[PDB]
Amino acid sequence: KVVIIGAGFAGLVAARELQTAGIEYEILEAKDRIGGRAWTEERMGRPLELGATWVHWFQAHTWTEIMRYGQRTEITASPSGNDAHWVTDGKVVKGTEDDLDEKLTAAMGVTYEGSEEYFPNPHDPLWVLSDDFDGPAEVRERFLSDDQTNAIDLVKEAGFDQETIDLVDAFWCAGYIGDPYTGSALMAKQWGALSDNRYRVMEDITLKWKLNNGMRSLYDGIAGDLNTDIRLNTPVAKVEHHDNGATVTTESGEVIEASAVICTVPVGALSNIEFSPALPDAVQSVIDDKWNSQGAKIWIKIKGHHRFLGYAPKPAKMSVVRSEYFMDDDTTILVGFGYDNTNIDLNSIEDAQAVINQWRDDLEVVDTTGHNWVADKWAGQAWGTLRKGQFTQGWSLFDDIDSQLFFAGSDYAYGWRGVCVDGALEKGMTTARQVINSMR
């Protein structure tokens, strides 16, 4: 009776929540697999995360699932103390990872600047615009202006030298997983607020601890709890939505009447669904302009054991590349993040070699792999990141649909929105509660 579109983390956790409340449901998933933009798969000789990878105990929703499904001690920190290399003036500069981190920490000071005023409760991101806001009006002015400024310009305007500008350029090419110059600096400020306003904590939360048994240990755990079979290979083509319910039509033409629809399809793939009535103009505007996520994630295998970290600014094929696994056959697997999925073939050895050649001529790529989420019609984006103006007139607009259609997914979370599974687990669960409370 409640139809959930998508068996990613948001749809799976929503289904479990409805099950707890005794509400009948059905999950319809387009692919022949569950997990969505979390996808653990054997490649290049071991399980690799083609999407979601890192977790932390300061992510409440993710951590509770880690505990629930037996993974409490099954996390491992990524390699640290790497030899670092960074782009600078079209030239490669060498240093320690600590040197690089010190420069990034200095720049984050200015990047986070108004977060203490904007986000006393970092899980109430739009408090500044609410009726409860009791601060100075200049705080609200600066909040709105920061939605229209990118994170690099904050560092430029503070007087940092070109080396730091190029370092933060590379950093935010990875963090916005897209062109950082089109992004909203408020996203970075909220990451600060959720990270105790410390660069080291932000990196601990988003870029340190990996699941030994993969994200699949969590998503298969949730699916294994469900008493209703997930309908795979069942893309939704149309959603009619009204005050008392909804009608879902599949690609095969099957019509399913529903008491509510929980739609977890990401913005990059919402164009595959016809909505009747059409979604509000303000929401359609976000869908047309989408979100800040045009980049890509690669895994590269090189000969030898090398503790490597590289940064390079836009328009590099990859902007952040780091050693992740030292393999038993004297190879290293590195992960990379880049701003433009169309400038790199994740499965081309020559392109992976070009990435490595950004910093070191003498390293030799023997394998490479990745999944181009942006070119995947059921995703159309990597993790959701915000363009200018989307912090205040973007993700939150998906909550005001005056009908039994509800949007859930990491890209609409209050907390670790888009970038983390924590946001999907948060928003799937709380949207199921919206449905539960309505029915009660």
Ligand X SMILES: Cc1cc2nc3c(=O)[nH]c(=O)nc-3n(C[C@H](O)[C@H](O)[C@H](O)COP(=O)(O)OP(=O)(O)OC[C@H]3O[C@@H](n4cnc5c(N)ncnc54)[C@H](O)[C@@H]3O)c2cc1C
Stretch that binds its own copies, among 20-28, 82-90, 111-119, 276-284 (CB under 8 A): 20-28
Q: Which residues contact 257 (CB under 8 A, 6 or more apart)?
A: 245, 246, 247
* Residue 204 CB, nearest approach to its own copies (Å): 8
* Residue 6 CB, nearest approach to its own copies (Å): 20
* Residue 68 CB, nearest approach to its own copies (Å): 6
Total of chain residues touching its own copies, rule CB under 8 A: 40
The reply to whether 77 sits near its own copies by the rule CB under 8 A is: yes
* Residue 264 CB, nearest approach to its own copies (Å): 17
The reply to whether 199 sits near its own copies by the rule CB under 8 A is: no
For the beta sheet containing 209-211, the strands, ordered from the edge strand earlier in sequence to the opposite edge, are 54-55, 209-211, 75-77
* Residue 121 CB, nearest approach to its own copies (Å): 6
* Residue 159 CB, nearest approach to its own copies (Å): 29
- By CB under 8 A, the residues from 101 to 130 that bind its own copies are 120-124, 127
Picking from 237, 240, 270, the residue whose alpha carbon sits closest to that of residue 404 is 240
**Based on CB atoms, which residue is closest to ligand X, 51 or 245?**
51
Decide which of its own copies, ligand X, none touches 326; Cβ closer than 5 to 8 Å per partner kind: none
Stretch that binds its own copies, among 36-44, 86-94, 312-320, 429-437 (CB under 8 A): 429-437
The reply to whether 430 sits near its own copies by the rule CB under 8 A is: yes
CA-to-CA distance for 91 and 89, rounded, in angstroms? 5
**Based on CB atoms, which residue is closest to its own copies, 205 or 318?**
205
Among 144, 247, 433, 439, contact with its own copies (rule: CB under 8 A): 433
Tokens in use for 252?
Answer: 């095969």
Query: DSSP string spanning 254-314?
Result: -EEEESEEEE---GGGGGGSEEESPPPHHHHHHHHH--S---EEEEEEEES---EEEE--T
**Based on CB atoms, which residue is closest to its own copies, 48 or 429?**
429
- By CB under 8 A, the residues from 34 to 63 that bind its own copies are 57-63
**Based on CB atoms, which residue is closest to ligand X, 341 or 358?**
341
Tokens in use for 261?
Answer: 């629809």
DSSP 30: S
Neighbours of 155 (CB within 10 A): 24
**How many Cα neighbours within 13 Å face the side chain of 168?**
27
CA-to-CA distance for 396 and 402, rounded, in angstroms? 14
Decide which of ligand X, its own copies, none touches 227; Cβ closer than 5 to 8 Å per partner kind: its own copies
Decide which of ligand X, its own copies, none touches 10; Cβ closer than 5 to 8 Å per partner kind: ligand X
Cβ contact 54:208 at 8 Å: yes
Positions touching ligand X (CB under 6 A) are 5-11, 28-31, 36-38, 51-54, 235-236, 264-266, 269, 272-273, 297, 373, 378-379, 382-383, 409-410, 418, 420-424
Decide which of its own copies, ligand X, none touches 430; Cβ closer than 5 to 8 Å per partner kind: its own copies
CA-to-CA distance for 48 and 112, rounded, in angstroms? 32
CA-to-CA distance for 322 and 53, rounded, in angstroms? 14
Decide which of ligand X, its own copies, none touches 58; Cβ closer than 5 to 8 Å per partner kind: its own copies
The reply to whether 93 sits near its own copies by the rule CB under 8 A is: no
- Distances 292 to 140, 185, 275, 288, 346 between C-alpha atoms, Å: 24, 12, 23, 12, 20
The SS3 of residue 91 is coil
Decide which of its own copies, ligand X, none touches 244; Cβ closer than 5 to 8 Å per partner kind: none
Site map for its own copies, 363-402, x if CB under 8 A?
----------------------------------------
Picking from 209, 189, 96, 107, the residue whose alpha carbon sits closest to that of residue 156 is 107
The reply to whether 78 sits near its own copies by the rule CB under 8 A is: no
**Based on CB atoms, which residue is closest to its own copies, 181 or 326?**
326
Neighbours of 93 (CB within 10 A): 17
* Ramachandran quadrant class, 298 (left: phi over 0; alpha: psi -120 to 50; beta: rest): beta
Neighbours of 325 (CB within 10 A): 19
Positions of E strands within 304-413: 308-311, 320-327, 331-338, 365-369, 405-407
* Beta bridge mates, 47: 42
Among 414, 417, 419, 423, contact with its own copies (rule: CB under 8 A): 414
Decide which of its own copies, ligand X, none touches 369; Cβ closer than 5 to 8 Å per partner kind: none
* Residue 235 CB, nearest approach to its own copies (Å): 28
Q: b or e along 176-199 (b: 16 or more beta carbons within 10 Å of the residue's beta carbon)?
A: bbbbbbebbbbbbbbbbbbbebeb
**Chain residues in the site for its own copies (CB under 8 A):** 16, 19-22, 57-64, 67-70, 72-73, 75, 77, 120-124, 127, 194, 196, 198, 201, 225, 227, 414-415, 426, 429-430, 433, 437
